Amino acid sequence: AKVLCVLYDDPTSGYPPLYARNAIPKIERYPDGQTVPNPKHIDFVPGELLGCVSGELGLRSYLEDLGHTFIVTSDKEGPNSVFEKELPDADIVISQPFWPAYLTAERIAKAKKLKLALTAGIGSDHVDLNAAIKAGITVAEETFSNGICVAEHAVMMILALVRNYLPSHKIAEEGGWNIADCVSRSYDLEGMHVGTVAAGRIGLAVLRRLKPFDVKLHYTARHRSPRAIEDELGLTYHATAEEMAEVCDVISIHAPLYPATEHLFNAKVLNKMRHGSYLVNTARAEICDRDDIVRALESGQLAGYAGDVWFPQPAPANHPWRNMPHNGMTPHMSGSSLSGQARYAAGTREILECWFENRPIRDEYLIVSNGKLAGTGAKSYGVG
Amino acid sequence: AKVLCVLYDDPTSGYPPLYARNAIPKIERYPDGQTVPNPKHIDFVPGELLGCVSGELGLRSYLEDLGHTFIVTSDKEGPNSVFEKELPDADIVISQPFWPAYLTAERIAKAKKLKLALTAGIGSDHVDLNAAIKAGITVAEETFSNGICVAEHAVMMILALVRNYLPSHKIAEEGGWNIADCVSRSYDLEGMHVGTVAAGRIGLAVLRRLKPFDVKLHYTARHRSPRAIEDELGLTYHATAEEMAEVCDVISIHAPLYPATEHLFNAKVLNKMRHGSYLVNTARAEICDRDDIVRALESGQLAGYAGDVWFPQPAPANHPWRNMPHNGMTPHMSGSSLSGQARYAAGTREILECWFENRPIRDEYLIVSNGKLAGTGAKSYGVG
Ligand SMILES: NC(=O)c1ccc[n+]([C@@H]2O[C@H](COP(=O)([O-])OP(=O)(O)OC[C@H]3O[C@@H](n4cnc5c(N)ncnc54)[C@H](O)[C@@H]3O)[C@@H](O)[C@H]2O)c1
Ligand SMILES: NC(=O)c1ccc[n+]([C@@H]2O[C@H](COP(=O)([O-])OP(=O)(O)OC[C@H]3O[C@@H](n4cnc5c(N)ncnc54)[C@H](O)[C@@H]3O)[C@@H](O)[C@H]2O)c1
């Protein structure tokens, strides 16, 4: 088979990078009991940079020894990119959400050999799922592989916004002190009302991390969580995002992107919050209305916004989220921490081993299978 | 009586600042059961900026209606400052750790009428406690008033360092994407060994917030914390900082500054840490050896350092912690969040009410009284 794999470019300083440490923690299970990936072998040391062109997700020896061809590129934009030129006869396509090879309906039609669209990471919305369903393509991802990474990044951003960390660090760097300027917009998180959109794998991980900050917790969901979870954490449930928006000082988004969540957080919802609220989005950018977020920050309706997700990806140099007021953005990096990469690279290999050996891909990894939403896709996504 | 009060300058934009929100959460009690301050009245709305010259800690009407004189200044450096000029006949001196009016033995000797040195906030190491003891000066601070603020700031900084937030935000602001550059030094906190120096009010708050991140928790103290605490958090105790350094990926300092803790974190301790470890210090700068920290970052012995405390304060524009590699510094701001300010300003007034009415200052607020370490000072500090 031909495996076509799109990864981001190597570090500016070169590959490999100079690693700050020589090992990372050993993770065996996710909080819900799911085991970390179980490929037969891995051809990397956990902690290595795997998600860039030279890193290759550690897959080359494995694929070529079986007689498959493995094409790796970062060049993914337009009909003249390496990606689109190599697409028509690729059996399998792999890319990461951080540098996504979009499989639009038009591209799927051109992909005459495509049978498996494999996300390296979590979130397969860069694939047109309706088109994949119609084309009979399997869509899968490494569920939970980098979910805790996102949960940490989200809680970090909540804190940085509320406490006014980023402008205060700039003052330290620039030679200032200026305590009054630092703290004129600095609040404690303690006692605020904080809500998550969804309490899935990441949403629940965030709620658990927020609990000892002594905030009052809220959430919305497609499907309400068990009573035991609500009792454990002291959750207040809301039937809609609008309802939650009315009562929360901070909201963090943790739902997947699909038609029913597209532009969920637009002006109508933003305006339901109390002036000077905070919004963190480490889910997907288009869950928010891009320009309404800017407008909310310019008016102070939002006191701050932060996230690592953008649309499109990569974000153009002039994307308005870069320099809008009171933002805490990063490029899309959370799930690509070196710790996270170890797990999703291992899961990518695990899935390929199953696929090539005619064994099932884990149900929890499935998004689309045999012409319908399947596995986690059937539980978490919609196509309406 | 004459009250001499040193506060930091007003915001550059003017006073009052434009507030992001009009109200803050109501806190009634601290986690150990201690009640928040109980002055008879407050002359401010919680949420207002109080720690600057125009804010006056909300004290002017209270003091002036009682016939006391109230001098507020930010000018605190040298014998020609408003502070040192007004000092000789001041009965009471108040300042905040964030912009501290240092009471050196020399200044205390000039202060012929000084009977009460009152810290607005937590931590009174800017007062020479030996000289205060000699002169029969009462030293007090508002215990717990901004402890949660510091704990939040410390956990925020831990995440920012480990995850490589700050350089990644700069990339987003500058128009880049560069995922490999962002994540070449980005790790999850999950599964790391994290230790605190002390498990006092702030240290315990930090340990509780760290717990749901699924880290392995350690601490060092002169004596063990209660079994209930160790069991709750799954704590591993170490007799010395050196011992804890050997096993932790991340350490956060939460002990007071006095002779036994001065330069505790010097090369000897730092070199016990594994190469690529992280250190956070929101306690006092001089618990670390300033230049040993710089060199540890330059060599990669530490992968990162962050804190909001410096020496001296304010830090000179050329202070080496500002631009040393891989830092997450802010000016000294954590305890002066608007949320914290409401509490310590209320407590400052409570202490003044007791003092003027000839009633005891709360034992937990006392550091020095009746010529010796007293209250919290006797339990937490030393005088070598
Ligand atoms: N750094 C990254 O790129 C990265 C990594 C992981 C996840 N993510 C994003 O976060 C999303 C969630 O991740 P997860 O691991 O928790 O997946 P998950 O499937 O376990 O949880 C998603 C939850 O969202 C709920 N949901 C669906 N529609 C909703 C709606 N309209 N309103 C409220 N809730 C709704 C689902 O029921 C589900 O419980 C991913 O789809 C992905 O987009 C990004
Ligand atoms: N960044 C900020 O804004 C800020 C604000 C306030 C206070 N602080 C600092 O944090 C310090 C602690 O605050 P707290 O409220 O938790 O006070 P605390 O008195 O409750 O806790 C101090 C703890 O340190 C322990 N300790 C004393 N000597 C020690 C030693 N030699 N080694 C290890 N542990 C030792 C004490 O026993 C005690 O448990 C303050 O003294 C202050 O310096 C920082």
PDB file of C-alpha atoms in Angstrom, chain A residues 8-13 17-25 27 29 31 47 49 52 98-99 148-150 152-153 155-157 159-160 163-166 168-169 171-192 208-209 212-214 249 274-278 300 303 306 308 310 312-317 322-323 327-341 343, chain B residues 8-13 17-25 27 29 31 47 49 52 98-99 148-150 152-153 155-157 159-160 163-166 168-169 171-192 208-209 212-214 249 274-278 300 303 306 308 310 312-317 322-323 327-341 343:
ATOM      1  CA  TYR A   8       4.670  19.933  10.114  1.00  0.00           C
ATOM      2  CA  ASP A   9       8.182  21.231   9.308  1.00  0.00           C
ATOM      3  CA  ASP A  10      11.299  20.474  11.354  1.00  0.00           C
ATOM      4  CA  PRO A  11      12.408  22.931  14.055  1.00  0.00           C
ATOM      5  CA  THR A  12      14.100  26.114  12.854  1.00  0.00           C
ATOM      6  CA  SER A  13      17.271  25.111  14.731  1.00  0.00           C
ATOM      7  CA  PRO A  17      16.196  19.434  18.580  1.00  0.00           C
ATOM      8  CA  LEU A  18      18.264  19.760  21.728  1.00  0.00           C
ATOM      9  CA  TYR A  19      15.974  18.078  24.263  1.00  0.00           C
ATOM     10  CA  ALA A  20      15.650  19.683  27.696  1.00  0.00           C
ATOM     11  CA  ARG A  21      15.320  16.290  29.422  1.00  0.00           C
ATOM     12  CA  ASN A  22      16.155  12.686  28.568  1.00  0.00           C
ATOM     13  CA  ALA A  23      12.965  10.913  29.658  1.00  0.00           C
ATOM     14  CA  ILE A  24       9.233  11.465  30.187  1.00  0.00           C
ATOM     15  CA  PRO A  25       6.748   9.839  32.613  1.00  0.00           C
ATOM     16  CA  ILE A  27       1.553   6.572  31.290  1.00  0.00           C
ATOM     17  CA  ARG A  29      -3.987   4.114  31.389  1.00  0.00           C
ATOM     18  CA  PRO A  31      -8.588   8.225  33.636  1.00  0.00           C
ATOM     19  CA  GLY A  47      10.094  12.050  24.477  1.00  0.00           C
ATOM     20  CA  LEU A  49      10.042  14.841  18.448  1.00  0.00           C
ATOM     21  CA  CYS A  52       7.640  16.857  12.124  1.00  0.00           C
ATOM     22  CA  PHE A  98      -1.911  20.820  14.217  1.00  0.00           C
ATOM     23  CA  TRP A  99      -0.986  20.801  10.521  1.00  0.00           C
ATOM     24  CA  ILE A 148      -4.851  15.244  29.069  1.00  0.00           C
ATOM     25  CA  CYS A 149      -2.412  17.519  27.181  1.00  0.00           C
ATOM     26  CA  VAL A 150      -5.338  19.650  26.049  1.00  0.00           C
ATOM     27  CA  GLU A 152      -3.672  21.020  31.056  1.00  0.00           C
ATOM     28  CA  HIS A 153      -3.348  23.658  28.301  1.00  0.00           C
ATOM     29  CA  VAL A 155      -6.583  25.133  32.668  1.00  0.00           C
ATOM     30  CA  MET A 156      -3.288  26.974  32.142  1.00  0.00           C
ATOM     31  CA  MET A 157      -5.019  29.429  29.755  1.00  0.00           C
ATOM     32  CA  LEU A 159      -5.464  30.941  34.858  1.00  0.00           C
ATOM     33  CA  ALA A 160      -3.313  33.120  32.580  1.00  0.00           C
ATOM     34  CA  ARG A 163      -4.731  36.538  36.500  1.00  0.00           C
ATOM     35  CA  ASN A 164      -3.428  38.756  33.632  1.00  0.00           C
ATOM     36  CA  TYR A 165      -0.230  36.717  33.269  1.00  0.00           C
ATOM     37  CA  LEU A 166       0.844  37.484  29.699  1.00  0.00           C
ATOM     38  CA  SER A 168       2.687  41.114  33.186  1.00  0.00           C
ATOM     39  CA  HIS A 169       5.424  38.799  31.925  1.00  0.00           C
ATOM     40  CA  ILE A 171       6.552  44.024  31.702  1.00  0.00           C
ATOM     41  CA  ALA A 172       9.102  41.873  33.553  1.00  0.00           C
ATOM     42  CA  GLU A 173      10.965  41.221  30.285  1.00  0.00           C
ATOM     43  CA  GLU A 174      10.881  44.918  29.323  1.00  0.00           C
ATOM     44  CA  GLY A 175      12.386  46.209  32.550  1.00  0.00           C
ATOM     45  CA  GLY A 176       9.218  47.477  34.222  1.00  0.00           C
ATOM     46  CA  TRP A 177       7.572  46.800  37.570  1.00  0.00           C
ATOM     47  CA  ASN A 178       4.316  48.699  37.383  1.00  0.00           C
ATOM     48  CA  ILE A 179       2.267  46.618  39.822  1.00  0.00           C
ATOM     49  CA  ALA A 180      -0.828  48.745  39.286  1.00  0.00           C
ATOM     50  CA  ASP A 181      -0.704  48.115  35.528  1.00  0.00           C
ATOM     51  CA  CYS A 182      -0.203  44.377  36.139  1.00  0.00           C
ATOM     52  CA  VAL A 183      -3.059  43.982  38.574  1.00  0.00           C
ATOM     53  CA  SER A 184      -5.675  46.441  37.254  1.00  0.00           C
ATOM     54  CA  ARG A 185      -7.128  43.456  35.394  1.00  0.00           C
ATOM     55  CA  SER A 186      -5.875  40.648  37.659  1.00  0.00           C
ATOM     56  CA  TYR A 187      -8.427  38.457  39.468  1.00  0.00           C
ATOM     57  CA  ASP A 188      -8.350  35.135  41.337  1.00  0.00           C
ATOM     58  CA  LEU A 189     -10.156  32.156  39.841  1.00  0.00           C
ATOM     59  CA  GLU A 190     -11.359  31.173  43.325  1.00  0.00           C
ATOM     60  CA  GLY A 191     -15.146  31.356  43.642  1.00  0.00           C
ATOM     61  CA  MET A 192     -15.901  32.117  40.006  1.00  0.00           C
ATOM     62  CA  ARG A 208     -11.541  17.572  37.713  1.00  0.00           C
ATOM     63  CA  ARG A 209      -8.535  19.892  37.496  1.00  0.00           C
ATOM     64  CA  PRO A 212      -9.787  22.165  43.917  1.00  0.00           C
ATOM     65  CA  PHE A 213      -9.615  25.794  42.745  1.00  0.00           C
ATOM     66  CA  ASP A 214     -12.907  26.141  44.610  1.00  0.00           C
ATOM     67  CA  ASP A 249     -17.637  33.882  34.538  1.00  0.00           C
ATOM     68  CA  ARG A 274     -21.919  39.102  32.029  1.00  0.00           C
ATOM     69  CA  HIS A 275     -19.656  41.862  30.832  1.00  0.00           C
ATOM     70  CA  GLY A 276     -16.016  40.924  31.402  1.00  0.00           C
ATOM     71  CA  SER A 277     -16.336  37.148  31.152  1.00  0.00           C
ATOM     72  CA  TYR A 278     -13.639  34.783  29.861  1.00  0.00           C
ATOM     73  CA  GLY A 300     -14.997  44.308  26.797  1.00  0.00           C
ATOM     74  CA  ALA A 303     -12.394  40.369  29.271  1.00  0.00           C
ATOM     75  CA  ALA A 306      -7.396  32.170  24.795  1.00  0.00           C
ATOM     76  CA  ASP A 308      -4.608  27.054  20.631  1.00  0.00           C
ATOM     77  CA  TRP A 310      -7.506  28.448  14.691  1.00  0.00           C
ATOM     78  CA  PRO A 312      -7.813  27.656   8.850  1.00  0.00           C
ATOM     79  CA  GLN A 313      -4.645  25.888  10.023  1.00  0.00           C
ATOM     80  CA  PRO A 314      -2.000  27.116   9.775  1.00  0.00           C
ATOM     81  CA  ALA A 315      -3.467  30.531  10.589  1.00  0.00           C
ATOM     82  CA  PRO A 316      -2.412  33.226   8.077  1.00  0.00           C
ATOM     83  CA  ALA A 317       0.073  35.831   9.372  1.00  0.00           C
ATOM     84  CA  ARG A 322      -3.229  37.051  16.714  1.00  0.00           C
ATOM     85  CA  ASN A 323      -3.344  40.619  17.960  1.00  0.00           C
ATOM     86  CA  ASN A 327      -5.818  37.271  24.056  1.00  0.00           C
ATOM     87  CA  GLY A 328      -3.783  34.310  25.305  1.00  0.00           C
ATOM     88  CA  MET A 329      -3.364  32.406  22.015  1.00  0.00           C
ATOM     89  CA  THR A 330      -0.749  29.877  21.036  1.00  0.00           C
ATOM     90  CA  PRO A 331      -0.383  28.068  17.721  1.00  0.00           C
ATOM     91  CA  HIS A 332      -2.029  24.621  17.758  1.00  0.00           C
ATOM     92  CA  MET A 333       0.391  22.806  20.065  1.00  0.00           C
ATOM     93  CA  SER A 334      -1.354  21.345  23.110  1.00  0.00           C
ATOM     94  CA  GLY A 335      -1.906  17.819  21.849  1.00  0.00           C
ATOM     95  CA  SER A 336       1.560  17.856  20.242  1.00  0.00           C
ATOM     96  CA  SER A 337       3.516  18.125  23.486  1.00  0.00           C
ATOM     97  CA  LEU A 338       6.336  15.582  23.313  1.00  0.00           C
ATOM     98  CA  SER A 339       4.463  13.550  25.951  1.00  0.00           C
ATOM     99  CA  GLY A 340       1.362  13.543  23.775  1.00  0.00           C
ATOM    100  CA  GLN A 341       3.236  12.718  20.582  1.00  0.00           C
ATOM    101  CA  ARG A 343       1.101   8.255  22.697  1.00  0.00           C
TER     102      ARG A 343
ATOM    103  CA  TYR B   8       2.758  51.606  44.631  1.00  0.00           C
ATOM    104  CA  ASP B   9       2.100  54.195  41.893  1.00  0.00           C
ATOM    105  CA  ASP B  10      -1.267  54.599  40.159  1.00  0.00           C
ATOM    106  CA  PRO B  11      -1.821  52.896  36.787  1.00  0.00           C
ATOM    107  CA  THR B  12      -0.063  54.582  33.852  1.00  0.00           C
ATOM    108  CA  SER B  13      -3.503  55.139  32.283  1.00  0.00           C
ATOM    109  CA  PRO B  17      -8.522  52.138  35.937  1.00  0.00           C
ATOM    110  CA  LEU B  18     -11.227  50.926  33.582  1.00  0.00           C
ATOM    111  CA  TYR B  19     -12.372  47.760  35.358  1.00  0.00           C
ATOM    112  CA  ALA B  20     -12.992  44.622  33.294  1.00  0.00           C
ATOM    113  CA  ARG B  21     -15.793  43.578  35.624  1.00  0.00           C
ATOM    114  CA  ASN B  22     -17.852  45.273  38.343  1.00  0.00           C
ATOM    115  CA  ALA B  23     -17.879  42.589  41.032  1.00  0.00           C
ATOM    116  CA  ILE B  24     -15.822  39.739  42.490  1.00  0.00           C
ATOM    117  CA  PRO B  25     -16.719  36.517  44.318  1.00  0.00           C
ATOM    118  CA  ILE B  27     -15.124  34.635  50.108  1.00  0.00           C
ATOM    119  CA  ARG B  29     -13.625  31.561  54.993  1.00  0.00           C
ATOM    120  CA  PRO B  31      -9.622  26.412  53.781  1.00  0.00           C
ATOM    121  CA  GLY B  47     -12.955  44.667  43.218  1.00  0.00           C
ATOM    122  CA  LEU B  49      -7.834  48.913  42.978  1.00  0.00           C
ATOM    123  CA  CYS B  52      -1.849  52.156  44.773  1.00  0.00           C
ATOM    124  CA  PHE B  98       4.908  44.195  46.335  1.00  0.00           C
ATOM    125  CA  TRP B  99       6.390  47.664  46.920  1.00  0.00           C
ATOM    126  CA  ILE B 148      -4.946  31.460  47.505  1.00  0.00           C
ATOM    127  CA  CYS B 149      -3.897  34.162  44.995  1.00  0.00           C
ATOM    128  CA  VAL B 150      -0.294  32.998  45.310  1.00  0.00           C
ATOM    129  CA  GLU B 152      -3.102  29.979  41.777  1.00  0.00           C
ATOM    130  CA  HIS B 153      -0.192  32.008  40.436  1.00  0.00           C
ATOM    131  CA  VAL B 155       0.284  26.436  39.631  1.00  0.00           C
ATOM    132  CA  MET B 156      -0.237  28.678  36.583  1.00  0.00           C
ATOM    133  CA  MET B 157       3.512  29.187  36.378  1.00  0.00           C
ATOM    134  CA  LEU B 159       2.015  24.725  33.751  1.00  0.00           C
ATOM    135  CA  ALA B 160       3.367  27.626  31.685  1.00  0.00           C
ATOM    136  CA  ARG B 163       4.174  23.355  28.540  1.00  0.00           C
ATOM    137  CA  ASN B 164       6.329  26.141  26.992  1.00  0.00           C
ATOM    138  CA  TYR B 165       3.434  28.626  26.927  1.00  0.00           C
ATOM    139  CA  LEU B 166       5.237  31.959  26.895  1.00  0.00           C
ATOM    140  CA  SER B 168       4.630  29.962  22.014  1.00  0.00           C
ATOM    141  CA  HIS B 169       2.330  32.925  22.695  1.00  0.00           C
ATOM    142  CA  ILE B 171       5.110  33.165  18.105  1.00  0.00           C
ATOM    143  CA  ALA B 172       1.329  33.558  17.756  1.00  0.00           C
ATOM    144  CA  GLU B 173       1.583  37.343  18.300  1.00  0.00           C
ATOM    145  CA  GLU B 174       4.427  37.634  15.773  1.00  0.00           C
ATOM    146  CA  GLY B 175       2.542  35.933  12.933  1.00  0.00           C
ATOM    147  CA  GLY B 176       4.180  32.487  13.100  1.00  0.00           C
ATOM    148  CA  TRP B 177       2.926  28.905  13.511  1.00  0.00           C
ATOM    149  CA  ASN B 178       6.071  26.833  13.854  1.00  0.00           C
ATOM    150  CA  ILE B 179       4.657  23.904  15.778  1.00  0.00           C
ATOM    151  CA  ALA B 180       8.025  22.135  16.065  1.00  0.00           C
ATOM    152  CA  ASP B 181       9.597  25.243  17.601  1.00  0.00           C
ATOM    153  CA  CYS B 182       6.702  25.471  20.076  1.00  0.00           C
ATOM    154  CA  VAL B 183       6.734  21.829  21.149  1.00  0.00           C
ATOM    155  CA  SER B 184      10.464  21.071  21.036  1.00  0.00           C
ATOM    156  CA  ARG B 185      10.444  21.945  24.756  1.00  0.00           C
ATOM    157  CA  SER B 186       6.784  21.221  25.562  1.00  0.00           C
ATOM    158  CA  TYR B 187       5.805  18.514  28.065  1.00  0.00           C
ATOM    159  CA  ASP B 188       2.726  17.471  30.007  1.00  0.00           C
ATOM    160  CA  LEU B 189       2.754  17.888  33.771  1.00  0.00           C
ATOM    161  CA  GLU B 190       0.868  14.563  34.097  1.00  0.00           C
ATOM    162  CA  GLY B 191       2.907  11.895  35.886  1.00  0.00           C
ATOM    163  CA  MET B 192       5.801  14.173  36.889  1.00  0.00           C
ATOM    164  CA  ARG B 208      -4.461  20.419  46.574  1.00  0.00           C
ATOM    165  CA  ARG B 209      -4.604  22.158  43.208  1.00  0.00           C
ATOM    166  CA  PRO B 212      -6.024  16.177  40.032  1.00  0.00           C
ATOM    167  CA  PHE B 213      -3.193  16.708  37.501  1.00  0.00           C
ATOM    168  CA  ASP B 214      -2.131  13.146  38.452  1.00  0.00           C
ATOM    169  CA  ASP B 249      10.877  17.125  38.238  1.00  0.00           C
ATOM    170  CA  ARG B 274      17.853  16.003  37.402  1.00  0.00           C
ATOM    171  CA  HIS B 275      19.005  17.952  34.350  1.00  0.00           C
ATOM    172  CA  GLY B 276      15.963  19.681  32.822  1.00  0.00           C
ATOM    173  CA  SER B 277      13.999  20.163  36.047  1.00  0.00           C
ATOM    174  CA  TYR B 278      11.735  23.137  36.836  1.00  0.00           C
ATOM    175  CA  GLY B 300      20.113  23.626  31.191  1.00  0.00           C
ATOM    176  CA  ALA B 303      14.757  23.717  32.040  1.00  0.00           C
ATOM    177  CA  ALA B 306       9.339  31.307  37.173  1.00  0.00           C
ATOM    178  CA  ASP B 308       6.815  36.799  40.941  1.00  0.00           C
ATOM    179  CA  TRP B 310      12.563  39.425  43.322  1.00  0.00           C
ATOM    180  CA  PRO B 312      15.402  43.853  45.891  1.00  0.00           C
ATOM    181  CA  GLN B 313      11.855  45.095  45.182  1.00  0.00           C
ATOM    182  CA  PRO B 314      11.305  46.793  42.895  1.00  0.00           C
ATOM    183  CA  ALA B 315      13.775  44.831  40.768  1.00  0.00           C
ATOM    184  CA  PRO B 316      16.186  47.152  38.940  1.00  0.00           C
ATOM    185  CA  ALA B 317      15.686  47.350  35.174  1.00  0.00           C
ATOM    186  CA  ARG B 322      14.357  39.497  33.669  1.00  0.00           C
ATOM    187  CA  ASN B 323      16.074  38.141  30.581  1.00  0.00           C
ATOM    188  CA  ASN B 327      11.935  32.189  32.490  1.00  0.00           C
ATOM    189  CA  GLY B 328       8.293  32.876  33.312  1.00  0.00           C
ATOM    190  CA  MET B 329       8.721  35.904  35.586  1.00  0.00           C
ATOM    191  CA  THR B 330       6.170  38.565  36.461  1.00  0.00           C
ATOM    192  CA  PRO B 331       6.662  41.573  38.739  1.00  0.00           C
ATOM    193  CA  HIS B 332       5.472  40.911  42.333  1.00  0.00           C
ATOM    194  CA  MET B 333       1.748  40.812  41.625  1.00  0.00           C
ATOM    195  CA  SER B 334       0.135  37.538  42.736  1.00  0.00           C
ATOM    196  CA  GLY B 335      -0.967  38.638  46.190  1.00  0.00           C
ATOM    197  CA  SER B 336      -2.142  41.983  44.770  1.00  0.00           C
ATOM    198  CA  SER B 337      -4.854  40.615  42.485  1.00  0.00           C
ATOM    199  CA  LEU B 338      -7.960  42.800  42.948  1.00  0.00           C
ATOM    200  CA  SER B 339      -9.494  39.818  44.748  1.00  0.00           C
ATOM    201  CA  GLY B 340      -6.593  39.583  47.194  1.00  0.00           C
ATOM    202  CA  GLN B 341      -6.485  43.352  47.683  1.00  0.00           C
ATOM    203  CA  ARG B 343      -9.103  40.890  51.670  1.00  0.00           C
TER     204      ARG B 343
END
